[PDB]
Amino acid sequence: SSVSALKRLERSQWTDKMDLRFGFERLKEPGEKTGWLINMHPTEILDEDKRLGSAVDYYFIQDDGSRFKVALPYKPYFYIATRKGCEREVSSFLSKKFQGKIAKVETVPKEDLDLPNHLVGLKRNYIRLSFHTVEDLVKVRKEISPAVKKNREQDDQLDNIVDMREYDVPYHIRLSIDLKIHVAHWYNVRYRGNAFPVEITRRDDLVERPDPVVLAFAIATTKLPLKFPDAETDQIMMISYMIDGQGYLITNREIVSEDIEDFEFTPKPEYEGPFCVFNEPDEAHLIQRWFEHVQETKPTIMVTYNGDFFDWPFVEARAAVHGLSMQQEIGFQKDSQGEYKAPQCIHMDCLRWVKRDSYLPVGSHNLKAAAKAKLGYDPVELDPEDMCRMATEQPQTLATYSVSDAVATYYLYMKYVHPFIFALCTIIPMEPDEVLRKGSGTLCEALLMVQAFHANIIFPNKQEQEFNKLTDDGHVLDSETYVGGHVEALESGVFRSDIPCRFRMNPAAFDFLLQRVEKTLRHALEEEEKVPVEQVTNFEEVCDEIKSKLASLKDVPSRIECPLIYHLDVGAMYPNIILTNRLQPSAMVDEATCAACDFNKPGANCQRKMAWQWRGEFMPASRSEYHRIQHQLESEKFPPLFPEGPARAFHELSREEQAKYEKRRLADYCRKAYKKIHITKVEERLTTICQRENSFYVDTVRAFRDRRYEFKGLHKVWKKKLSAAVEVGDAAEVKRCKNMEVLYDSLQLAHKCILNSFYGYVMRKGARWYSMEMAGIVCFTGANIITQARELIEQIGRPLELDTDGIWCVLPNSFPENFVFKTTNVKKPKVTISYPGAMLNIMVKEGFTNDQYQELAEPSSLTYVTRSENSIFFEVDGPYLAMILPASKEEGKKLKKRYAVFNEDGSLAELKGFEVKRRGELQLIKIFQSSVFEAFLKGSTLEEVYGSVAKVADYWLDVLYSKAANMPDSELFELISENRSMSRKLEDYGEQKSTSISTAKRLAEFLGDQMVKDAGLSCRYIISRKPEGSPVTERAIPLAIFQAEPTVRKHFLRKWLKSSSLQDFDIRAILDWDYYIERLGSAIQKIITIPAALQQVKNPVPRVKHPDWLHKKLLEKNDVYKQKKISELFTLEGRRQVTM
Amino acid sequence: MFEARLVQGSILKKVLEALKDLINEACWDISSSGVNLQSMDSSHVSLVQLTLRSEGFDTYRCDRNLAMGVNLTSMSKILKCAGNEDIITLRAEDNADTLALVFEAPNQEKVSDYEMKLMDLDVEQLGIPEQEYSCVVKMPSGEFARICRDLSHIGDAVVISCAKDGVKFSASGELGNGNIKLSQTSNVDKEEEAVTIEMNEPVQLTFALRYLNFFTKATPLSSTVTLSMSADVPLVVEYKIADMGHLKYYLAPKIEDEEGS
Amino acid sequence: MFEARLVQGSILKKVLEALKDLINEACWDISSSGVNLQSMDSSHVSLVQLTLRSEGFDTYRCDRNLAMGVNLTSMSKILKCAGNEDIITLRAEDNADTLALVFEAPNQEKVSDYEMKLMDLDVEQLGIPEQEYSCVVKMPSGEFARICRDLSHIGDAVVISCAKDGVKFSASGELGNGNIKLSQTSNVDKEEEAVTIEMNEPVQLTFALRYLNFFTKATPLSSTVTLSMSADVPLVVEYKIADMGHLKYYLAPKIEDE
Amino acid sequence: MFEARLVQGSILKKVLEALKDLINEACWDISSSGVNLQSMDSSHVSLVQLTLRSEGFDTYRCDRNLAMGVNLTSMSKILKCAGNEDIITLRAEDNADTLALVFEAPNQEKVSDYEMKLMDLDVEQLGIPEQEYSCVVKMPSGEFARICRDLSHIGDAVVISCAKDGVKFSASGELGNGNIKLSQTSNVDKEEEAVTIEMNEPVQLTFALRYLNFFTKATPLSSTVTLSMSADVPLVVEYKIADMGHLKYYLAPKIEDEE
DNA sequence: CCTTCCACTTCCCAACCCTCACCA
DNA sequence: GAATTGGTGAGGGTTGGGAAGTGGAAGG
Ligand SMILES: Nc1ncnc2c1ncn2[C@H]1CC[C@@H](COP(=O)(O)OP(=O)(O)OP(=O)(O)O)O1
Ligand code: SF4
Ligand SMILES: [Mg+2]
């Protein structure tokens, strides 16, 4: 032990030296100071007994640039539960058993929502245990856990212990949850000497934020031609970085052929980008100079793009090669998870934000794409192989590139990441490293632990996964799931506001609407707008124009009209469904618990019962057959963990090994004894939701919804003020206003992200508050709503696309559209309403509205008020100019989730699911699709529309049939190649066949395991003709060989084309033109020709044939010999049914 | 009870193997006069009629008339168990939940028995015009089978024309044209090979071969088939089953729309 | 060195395809007594024994024991190339990792010669014990093959029952039940054509029919088949190969869920 | 006008059943000497050659030489309608777009009469080389078919070795290696089993079994197959049709440069 | 000797299982 | 110590059953 205790003292001292070097001078002296909390860490401090005690160090910054630390000691603790009357005996044994190991133990009443009959007010005494250090907790829990484990399976004083809670919450998070200490707030702190703990208290009065010094850096290295760099071989050429808007550049004259002059780079006037330059003779001087300039400026946040992957490991290794221990000079060290962290500063990585909250496609996670998308400028590019020649031939261009990556990194970090992350830090207990790195379900869990603590709830233990659970009918389940969101593409082809389109309608549906027009408007004003109906003068007029237009429609239900294209969808559907129904992860109950609740009384209104669809998949073997296969393993024996170790019997295996062996045996047995290894089963279930249970979850969701809309409004107000201040030109007021604008915009984004998180968390594996039912009930209620909106629209008009929460439809030109009300109150003098909205909304309000909401009005008397609510409201987007949907190549199928939509200005409004966005799909498809979508806008009739659209699809077939004859040779390699990813290691896939695996092996043969070794390899290939009749996967050839040396190409192609006599080694010979033309034929059919046959126009593309089934149907339509039915030629005698 | 025994199970096997493709479920009407089945395909273009007479069975009992529904593919499955030489017995009763079958070899070396599950059906009933037909032709069934297969390779629709000199089948498609022709047998080598045409007046009609393909599966029942045709009404093909009965398919023609105009 | 010659060369072809699909790979044991083989179903529910005799070969040299691993697909793809009338020679060595097969045409105008790789297997074995089978049946092979095929259309499990005077096969499923009865006869024409059942006490047992549909692949080895049964004991199917050997399949009876 | 009557109507079926795998669309030519077709296969690996002399038909009229572009899958499907006993007759007119095929039942019981649409084609062709080969081998066709199927089972490609006393085939691949030898017959009792070899100089050569395994589709066409082989020149595989004609495949030897 | 039935092999199409990336 | 959900398209490979053709032996 003592060696470890001294090692802990050593590291505590070293870290205190390291952060002292960066000016985080520890507070040790009487006085009072104030500052902004930027970071925290857990550490032990030496006390007056010269003992280590566990503590937390808080790091503050001040407006003058000064900084300090405070060390706050707090005892870690957790709870144990015991049987009736055990507490004094168990506590006395806990103390004597571990005397001197535990600091304090005490009896604490807490409320657990899982207790029976708890709504009356019943709560139970847990025992708290607390320790001088977490190491004694980690020891003692391992002395308790076997006893509670055995009693949990079955059900000395350890046997009297029944359960243990909260033992795995992180200690620092346990402190920020408890002391309400939170990051990005101004604090006043009072130091009283070690005679008292240091006291921290927030000031709400100040809202301005300081500017903590942020350093962003990027590097460029030499590498071997056509291959990856590695730190043993290569050297850094340049490092470029910015501190707080000032740029700096270092260049190594071992490699860079000339000294670099200082220069200025500005993509757009907002990005200042002045760069100062230091020339160094040696790599060791480049490193030393950078370490010196970092030790001078002493930054508090350090940023780079994806730094844990390359930029830190390379500069670390090249520093250590010269003996510069960067862990000593800078302080940055690789943590256990392989991520660089430091005591004195925070490592923020932009890509861990882009990958999590930017909503960019994976197509554009490359820095130059994410910069081009969010910053609105195109950065500068180099071929990654040329950098080593450019560093000799034209150094200025390499410097310009490496500076441009620094500028883009710094501004991308400042504008998008920094407001967001510190705003989210204001509401979560976690450090800015953990908040950025962790997954959103964890953020939501910490937030719920904050709220559960404030409610004085005791947390549940994390859910533990069961293996191979049994269906009641006896089959072992492979999987369980709930049925998700409904989808159907109802229509296909082209819709436009400018072409005649044919409608047929049900006049009884018009009569039904016209009968209720008054109710639809009276509701749509009072509930949705919240304007009393008395306050408006023209209400009786507008109803007559609505009724008369509906009557004029009713008189002629079938007509040709121009369409109105509308999108009709629900705002924040799933949160609103939760708030409306009062769903909570703990509120699901069964008859067995409602049997105990004293509120279970005749006519008790609180049991709400809702339907969801369970789904399972299971293996067809029976209960006894599986049990026999389990017995058959009683004689099996298995390898050790290491080649010389003892062989293990089946009962000596881990339960994860056991389950995998059993699944292998049963999967082989079922494949022998039956053709089919699995069966799907679907089952309607009804679940009872308690309506009185503690609301802390639902009230949390409510609070985040409301505060989101409050900050959205304040952002609108301040953005107006900002526009006015800019037009007037008051630069100090402009700065004040812009600061408030960015503060509210980041706060509202952070609340939107947190609100989105609450649904999926309840399904996360091992979440504390976990239940599958609440996610099913939400998905099914969101499938009902959208289905009934489809049904109601399908009589009036033609719904086109339907997904989880919104419908795309066309409506007749004569429809009501929007109306205006004039208000007597000047506070809201005019109001507008949209009829399709109120029409759908009243349908929602009639069926879905809850009438069982209950709220505890008097905590002393257990009296609950009973209330109704609906929070679900539709809203309208559009009307749009044009809409286009593709059609399936197979007969009668319809392609879901694919469409394009345009604004009235002809700017592309939406374009969804198409290969133009996807990462990897063939570039020829991207360009073809993009150009045809634009081409559809042209023309005025379906004949002219397709006459336009045809030529853009003809152009690419003309090029391919011409073998791109005139196209430059460098163009084909970008036009013709995929860039597909490979997510796993090449060994981990197993024995599978695929084109990416094939071409990775085809690289391994050519440059060795050095190139495959890392995960995430990118594979660029073309598919080749010469191995005639060889299956597709075997004809995939890397692009790299067309860059490799001639004598290597003329060898490896001769090997891979299985053609030793081959004289011609040119892509234009090698290309399988009839594969790529079949790919384009597969695309062009789905958009331009098959939809055409579905819209009564002849084939617009002569070169492409229809599918055979469609040619049969179109040939059968048109001949003159019509098929009669037998029932029309022979007399029908009657109808009969046969039954026993 | 209903009880029947058949001199050779190959007949009922060949019947079920001919019904299996065209009508998936059907009901049988049973009486002391015999067994009747009539049903209509899932597209109402063609109609099947089957009649087995009381006398053809080796022994027959029918205490009361019965009607029962049968999923024909499952019966064809069970009847795949019986050997070609086997003797087969059917038994049923008015509780009508199940049909019992017994199959045995002529030497009683082995016994096989089964209980087919019956099913519930609803179906519409049609009448028949019972006219005389302006042309009738009697044909070797193997020749009509080959005519259908070969011309079906040329195209999806057949034209049938009957004229004093000889019957003609014609078809055409994207490949070109095909014509197949038969004539009056002047000297009969054997009657089973003879073709005979008798007519009131010549006839021309057109039909979908996708259905005839399903009728010609009757060819292994009997060596000769009857074709009957008349203007603007269904074509008849008819196969006779020994002295026991007959199986008939009616096919509604394709008619020229221009008169409809 | 091991070397052997077989004039009835088609036997090895017929005997191999009866295993090719039931067991993926096997360890053969070679000794002066003859080639012997225990191997187990990949699902380990069922077991194979093959046993030839060295007296039956046209020539047989075995001066030492060998154990050799082979995956039977690899032999099968070679024996496909032998004509049924041709004479087979096998050659192996104690240090070698390959096997040589020579096919000799009776006309002596054609010869063929193949070498295949062994595989490196070892297998842990319990010697299969004798049982005093309470029930034994001898039947013509095609009858049993037809029973197992025709019942396979009804359903995936067969209840086989036996009596002092016959046997019954029965199956129950979604199409309805079906049975086949085979009574014992005293009158018999010939052994290739006749049944002989003997039973000490009544037994009936349930067996997976999709397994028997594998065992029936041995049918062309013999004009008759032997089956034996007892309660709580595996069923054994046995084929005799001239007097050159025998092949047996062992299968456990189904545990009833009731 | 052109017309021809073929009483041996099966041979035209078996020819189309042979060609349809190697070439999908081809142009026939017709002359006073008879019918010719020579064409590269679709992959341009190997060359197919066929001719039928006009002396083979029951009668033949050909007023001018002509060429007819035809789809072999279509003509194969049409000819599958003729019975093997039936007479075939072909006719066309020099300005017609269509070929007329008549099938007559021998007993005159029946007639059938089909037309197929022509298409317009032109194709590149050269005078076929022939010379004295170093090796010639004659064999029962079924034996060569079994040899090809077995070696294609074991291996990718066959190497053929030649001697005065016999001929040997060998292959190797993932399953192992295999060797097959046929010796010259000592004396012949019935001809078709007799293997006979002509041998001027030793030859050993390698060929791709995919194409021999197509070429063997002509096995139903005659009971005796012939092979002609020499160093550094295409293998010729030859089948002789009735009296009237012949079918040849030309396939270049596999190069083994990598050594 | 000629014709029919049964057995075995080959050819062709449909359905299921794998990857990755995008719609909610 | 770690850990959001379900649904769809596109491209590719593997598995199983039915239809068609050929060879033998069996029957008249
Ligand atoms: N990342 C994700 N994780 C889990 N569920 C998700 C999800 N993204 C979408 N869903 C599911 C659950 C929610 C649902 C989308 O419907 P709403 O109306 O609730 O979302 P929205 O359209 O963004 O809100 P609005 O802009 O109208 O305010 O899709
Ligand atoms: S839902 Fe009602 S009856 Fe059930 S536990 Fe809650 S309060 Fe009691
Ligand atoms: Mg929404």
Euclidean distance between CA atoms A1054 and A1062, whole angstroms: 7
The reply to whether A620 has its C-beta less than 7 Å from any atom of strand E is no
Sign, CA dihedral A624-A630-A634-A636, equals positive
SS3 D141: helix
Position D51, amino acid: T
Sheet holding D2-6, edge to edge: B203-208, B157-163, B166-173, B176-183, D110-117, D98-104, D87-92, D2-6, D59-62
Give which of D124, D162, D138, D109 is closest to D39, Cα–Cα: D124
**Which chain E positions have some atom within 7 A of a protein CB?**
5-8, 10, 17-24
CB A320 within 8 A of CB A326: yes
Q: How far is the CA of B42 from the C1' of E18 (A)?
A: 39
Kindly report the protein residue whose alpha carbon is nearest to atom 10 of ligand 1. Answer: A756
Query: Pocket of ligand 1, candidates A440, A487, A756, A844: which has the most ligand atoms within 8 Å of its Cβ, to mutate?
Result: A756
> Any alpha helices (H) in A484-538, and if so which ranges?
507-523
Euclidean distance between CA atoms B73 and B23, whole angstroms: 9
- Is B168 within a domain? yes
B125 at the A interface (CB within 8 A)? yes
What distances in angstroms separate CA D76 from CA A15, A330, A884, B128, D81, one per listed residue? 88, 82, 45, 43, 9
Q: Per the structure block, which two tokens stand in for A145?
A: 């856990």
Euclidean distance between CA atoms A402 and A241, whole angstroms: 9
CB C97: neighbour CB atoms within 10 A?
A: 12
Chain C interface disruption, residue of D151, D179, D188, most C CBs within 10 A: D179
Distance from CA of residue C245 to its chain's centroid? 10
What is the residue whose two structure tokens read 């109402």? Answer: B44
Bond preceding residue A879 cis, omega within 30 of 0: yes
* Sequential DSSP letters for A690-721: ESSS--HHHHHHHHHHHHHHHHHHHHHHHHHH
Helix axes A923-936, A969-976, angle to 10 degrees: 80
Kindly report the protein residue whose alpha carbon is nearest to atom 8 of ligand 1. Answer: A756
A622 at the C interface (CB within 8 A)? yes
- What is the distance in A from the centroid of ligand 1 to the CA of A573? 7
CA gyration radius, chain D: 20
Euclidean distance between CA atoms A981 and A996, whole angstroms: 8
DSSP A460: P
CATH top-level class for A2-74+181-202?
mainly beta
Q: How far is the CA of A1004 from the C1' of F14 (A)?
A: 27
Euclidean distance between CA atoms A355 and A349, whole angstroms: 11
Q: Which nucleotide is nearest to A1082 (CA to C1')?
A: F10
Distance from CA of residue A420 to its chain's centroid? 16
Q: How many CB pairs under 8 A join B and D?
A: 44
* Among chain C residues, CA nearest to A666: C43
Specify which residues D182 forms β-bridges with.
Answer: C110, D167
Euclidean distance between CA atoms A437 and A346, whole angstroms: 12
Euclidean distance between CA atoms D17 and A938, whole angstroms: 52
Q: Domain A214-315+345-426, what fold?
A: Nucleotidyltransferase; domain 5 (3.30.420)
Whether the CB of A430 sits within 6 Å of ligand 2: no
Give which of A848, A849, A833 is closest to A787, Cα–Cα: A848
Q: How far is the CA of A676 from the C1' of F16 (A)?
A: 11
CB A698 within 8 A of CB A578: yes
The reply to whether A984 has its C-beta less than 7 Å from any atom of strand E is yes
Specify which residues A833 forms β-bridges with.
Answer: A819
Q: Which nucleotide is nearest to A1083 (CA to C1')?
A: F10
Q: Could you tell me which residues come within 8 angstroms of residue A389 by beta carbon, excluding any fewer than 6 positions away?
A: none
Euclidean distance between CA atoms A254 and A760, whole angstroms: 54
D188 at the C interface (CB within 8 A)? no
Nearest Cβ partner of D43 from A1028, A1055, A1060? A1028
SS3 A12: helix
Beta carbons of A1060 and D254 less than 8 Å apart: yes
The reply to whether A908 has its C-beta less than 7 Å from any atom of strand E is no
- Is B243 within a domain? yes
Query: Which chains are within 8 Å of C by 3+ CB pairs?
Result: A, B, D
Position A319, amino acid: A
The reply to whether A157 has its C-beta less than 7 Å from any atom of strand E is no
Euclidean distance between CA atoms A285 and A289, whole angstroms: 6
Residue A251 has, within 13 A of its CA and on its CB side, a CA count of: 25
Tell me the shortest Cα–Cα distance from B174 to chain D, in angstroms.
8
Specify which residues B203 forms β-bridges with.
Answer: B162
Euclidean distance between CA atoms A161 and A159, whole angstroms: 5
B155 at the A interface (CB within 8 A)? no
What distances in angstroms separate CA A77 from CA A123, A126, A469, D104, one per listed residue? 20, 12, 35, 103
The reply to whether A546 has its C-beta less than 7 Å from any atom of strand E is no
What is the residue whose two structure tokens read 């393993």? Answer: A633
SS3 A736: helix
Q: How many domains does chain B have?
A: 1
Residues of chain C positioned with their CB less than 8 A from the CB of D146: 81
Q: Which residues of C3-41 are buried (b: 16+ CB within 10 A; e: fewer)?
A: bbbbebbbbbbbbbbbbbebbeebbbbbeeebbebbbeb
CB A967: neighbour CB atoms within 10 A?
A: 12
Position B179, amino acid: N
What distances in angstroms separate CA A745 from CA A186, A715, A719, A751, one per listed residue? 20, 6, 10, 10
CB D52: neighbour CB atoms within 10 A?
A: 23
Euclidean distance between CA atoms C22 and C50, whole angstroms: 13
Distance from CA of residue A126 to its chain's centroid? 38
What are the φ/ψ torsions at residue A282 (nearest 5 degrees)? -130, 155
Beta carbons of A665 and C43 less than 8 Å apart: yes
Domain residues for the domain of B42 are 1-256
DSSP A1074: H
Euclidean distance between CA atoms A80 and B2, whole angstroms: 78
Pairing state of beta strands A246-252 and A274-280? parallel
What distances in angstroms separate CA A30 from CA A55, A191, A309, C168, one per listed residue? 20, 6, 45, 101
The H-or-E segment that residue B153 falls in is: helix B141-154
SS3 A428: coil
- The CATH number for C241's domain is 3.70.10.10
> Any alpha helices (H) in A729-834, and if so which ranges?
731-761, 773-796
Residue A974 has, within 13 A of its CA and on its CB side, a CA count of: 6
Give the resolution in Å.
3.6
- Return the domain boundaries, chain A: 2-74+181-202, 77-166, 214-315+345-426, 488-584+777-880, 882-963+1077-1118, 969-1070
